[PDB]
């Protein structure tokens, strides 16, 4: 019935549940394109469904928390791949050639004293 | 003006405003953290000895 992947990216966490069906997709109880409305990049979320043909063959109940939409989009891209590799282990030999099962460790780097913001150094003068 | 200024800081006077933080070992009047009652020098000096309970070099 219900397949699961946890998706995380950059302080975003995506609880992702996959069922079979017509093709519908909900994020925090909203339609996917109402939630991610106007964000050119949103579609990237489902890119792991297209990688196994199986787009419309699934319905997905997604909850998402923390971060911003684009992290959430990425987190969802990971949940969705984790979820479906869950219910068919072979969806992995063709899903790992793309990055879909990687987490993406890239995170805001820490502000450091003496710098203005991690690397950006104060302007230096001499004269 | 120092010994008598660490003293006049303890007496509490006309107008509540005139009172000020003032470090508890150093008489220092600047950079005293109200949690510890200590100057930022004082706090470092003690912190390193393990005499501020709980207090540790932070790193993240």
């Amino acid at each position: 019935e219900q397949y699961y992947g946890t998706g995380r990216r950059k302080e975003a966490v995506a609880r992702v549940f996959l069922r079979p069906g017509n093709g519908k997709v909900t994020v925090n109880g909203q339609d996917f394109n109402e939630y991610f409305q106007g964000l050119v990049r949103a579609v990237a979320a489902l890119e792991p469904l297209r990688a196994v043909d199986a787009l419309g063959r699934f319905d997905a109940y997604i909850t998402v928390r923390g971060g911003g939409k684009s992290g959430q989009i990425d987190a969802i891209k990971l949940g969705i791949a984790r979820a479906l590799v869950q219910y068919n282990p072979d969806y992995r030999a063709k899903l790992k050639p793309l990055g879909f099962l990687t987490r993406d460790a890239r995170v805001v780097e820490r502000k450091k004293y003496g710098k203005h913001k991690a690397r950006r150094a104060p302007q230096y003068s001499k004269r | 003006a120092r010994k008598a200024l660490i003293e006049k800081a303890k007496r509490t006077p006309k107008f509540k405003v005139r009172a000020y933080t003032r470090c508890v070992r150093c008489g220092r009047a600047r950079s005293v953290y109200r949690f510890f009652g200590l100057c930022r020098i004082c706090l470092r000096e003690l912190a390193h000895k393990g005499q501020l309970p709980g207090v540790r070099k932070a790193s993240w």
Binding site: - | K49, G50, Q51
Partner: protein, 206 residues
């Protein structure tokens, strides 16, 4: 300007607090202040006793002070009259009731604070520094240290030009965080001002 406090650098790991109580924002201020008037008083009165630490625990708002001395004889008294007044002194200056326990520092030659104090005391009494230093380090190592360092600051022998005579034996891996390097620091007050003394004793790993 460098080398951080080998104690401060350890704390969670390898080496423990000298005061372990809890207090919230409203309280810490006042208990810390006490701690300090406590340590301060014991720091001068128990000089002759060679005190290394003054650990301070605190529970049901009641205060136990362990004084880790080399010479409990001196803190105690004949049949304990001195420690009497000491328990009463603390009580005078704290509005409270304070346990004051002694604890013999088993080997004083592995107590960095003491080694340091001893060299400082030696200097205060016009002893040759280089030799005093070198000997302190022999004592430490003889007492089974894996390594030891001692450093006298400047105005050695009374000079105009301040200096810094160091001297060391064994390992003193200051960057190594599992090490357990006791560290200690006493003054020499002299006719010619202050010299500071640092001792590092390295005792073992893990």
């Amino acid at each position: 300007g460098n080398k951080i406090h080998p104690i401060g650098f350890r704390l969670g790991i390898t080496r423990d607090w000298e005061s372990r109580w809890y207090a919230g924002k409203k309280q810490y201020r006042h208990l810390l202040l006490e701690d300090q008037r406590i340590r301060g008083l014991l720091e001068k009165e128990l000089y002759s006793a060679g005190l290394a630490r003054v650990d301070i625990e605190r529970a049901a708002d009641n205060v136990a002070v362990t004084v880790h001395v080399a010479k409990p004889g001196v803190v105690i008294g004949r049949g304990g009259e001195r420690i009497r007044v000491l328990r009463e002194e603390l009580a005078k200056l704290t509005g409270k009731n304070v346990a004051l326990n002694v604890q013999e520092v088993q080997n004083p030659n592995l107590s960095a604070p003491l080694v340091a104090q001893r060299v400082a005391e030696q200097i205060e009494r016009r002893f040759a520094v280089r030799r005093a230093i070198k000997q302190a380090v022999q004592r430490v190592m003889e007492s089974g240290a894996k390594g030891a360092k001692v450093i006298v600051s400047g105005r050695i022998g009374g000079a105009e030009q301040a200096r810094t005579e160091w001297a060391a034996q064994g390992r003193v891996p200051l960057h190594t965080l599992r090490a357990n390097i006791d560290y200690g620091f006493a003054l020499a007050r002299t006719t010619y001002g202050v010299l500071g003394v640092k001792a590092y004793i390295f005792l073992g790993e893990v």
